[PDB]
Amino acid sequence: SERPSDLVVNRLVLFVVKGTATSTHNTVKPLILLEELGVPHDIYVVEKVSAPWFSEINPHKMVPAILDRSPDGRDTLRAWESTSTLMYIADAYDKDGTFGGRNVQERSEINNWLTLHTAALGPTAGYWLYFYKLHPEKLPKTIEKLRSNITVQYDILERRLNEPGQQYLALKDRPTIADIATLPFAMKSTAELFGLEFEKWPKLQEWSVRMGEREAVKRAWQRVAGFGHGEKEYGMLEA
Amino acid sequence: SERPSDLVVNRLVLFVVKGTATSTHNTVKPLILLEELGVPHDIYVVEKVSAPWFSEINPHKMVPAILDRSPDGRDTLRAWESTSTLMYIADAYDKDGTFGGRNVQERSEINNWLTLHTAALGPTAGYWLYFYKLHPEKLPKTIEKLRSNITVQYDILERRLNEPGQQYLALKDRPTIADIATLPFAMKSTAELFGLEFEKWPKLQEWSVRMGEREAVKRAWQRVAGFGHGEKEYGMLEA
What we know:
Two copies of one chain form a homodimer. In chain A, strands 4-3-1-2-5 form a five-stranded mixed β-sheet, with helices on one face. Chain A has 239 residues and is of the alpha+beta class. In chain A, helix 1 packs parallel to helix 3, helix 4 (104-134) runs antiparallel to helix 5 (140-161) and helix 5 (140-161) crosses helix 8 (202-212). Chain A is built from nine helices and five strands; from the N terminus they run βαβαββαααααααβ. The first copy, chain A, has a domain at 104-217: Up-down Bundle (Glutathione S-transferase Yfyf (Class Pi), Chain A, domain 2). The first copy, chain A, is globular. Chain A binds chain B through residues 59-60, 70-71, 75, 77-81, 83-84, 87-88, 91-92, 103-105, 107-109, 111-112, 114-116, 118-120, 122-124, 127, 131, 135, 137, 139, 141-142, 145, 156, 159-160, and chain B through 59-60, 70-71, 75, 77-81, 83-84, 87-88, 91-92, 103-105, 107-109, 111-112, 114-116, 118-120, 122-124, 127, 131, 135, 137, 139, 141-142, 145, 156, 159-160. Chains A, B: Residues 103-236 form the GST C-terminal domain.
């Protein structure tokens, strides 16, 4: 029923679970943006997302989630769903729009490509994994349709990245929250999990390697893998 | 790739398809916000979403989509995915944040409840509608699992609307783009299509009725049903 005594919100707190091969593809998203912007933050390793206290933070009972102070430090705000955590970090910590967009025109495309991930590849990948791994009985017709739908999303991303000068999904010049949201579900290791040959989408594979070379992305993958493997297995990690 | 001769962008153009009992749950979303804000706009009824000119607007080949003039009037911009059309209209036309949020505090919850719809109920309902109506063969076990997942989303909305003073999903005081996004998939007629008893979620049902009493919502449902049923079956509508 009650918040753990080590959960205090003195600045942004990102909620994660213990790092495994399969626990980090959504939690890494806000962490990449925190690392890009140099946002001061704490990490809280949630032992059980089923815990009643955790549903007060995220009623969908998943990581990532954020608690942070309001602009005047007085109130506590929350963000949950990985796409919403990116929108919150950009609103509170990216006023100049380096990752969130500098104007109505840039935001139009950032929101198109971010929403395509949020509504299409993200939930399709989620449902593919659910039916492939977790659903008690195997529904092969359903699983094959979902696999097919993943390839359709990779075809859209490949089309975009073949447009002249289009180095990133939303903007020609630099990565945005649309790129950060898409990357974990559009990289070779994830394509292989889906039983797909990522070399079939060469411009998308090139883009995924370019994103993977960014120091903030390397730092985010290194940290998210290690959460709950240190001295403290669960709770507020020592800063 | 050549656009039809009647596709000119003198103001916001909302792309829809001919109205049916199932063609309007996503296109009505931006239309509600256009009606709320009194945004001047045109309606373009797309005969074939597979037409090359249309996939240059939305690479996912679905409605709704938008073309509009950039703020300086020197370029055209686009929006696609219903959640992105809401974000675009709020950005370009809701300068007071009446529907998009006035500060980081309000937007944290608007973005949580909008993203919950975009990532969870919207794609779960979409895969329900796909397998129920469009898939060449009937997959009842998948339809059954998706129906159960819809109830989990109704349970989260019901929980939120049982919190003291919480009259709308995101904000206590007024509806936002989170409420507009959610309404078409959380109202009695849609629940009945899904084979659910909407009375099992009483605060969610009362919220859906409150939303349905809004003159802008009544106008959007009346208009979206009639697109393509008048003098022009397809193309840029008159008046």
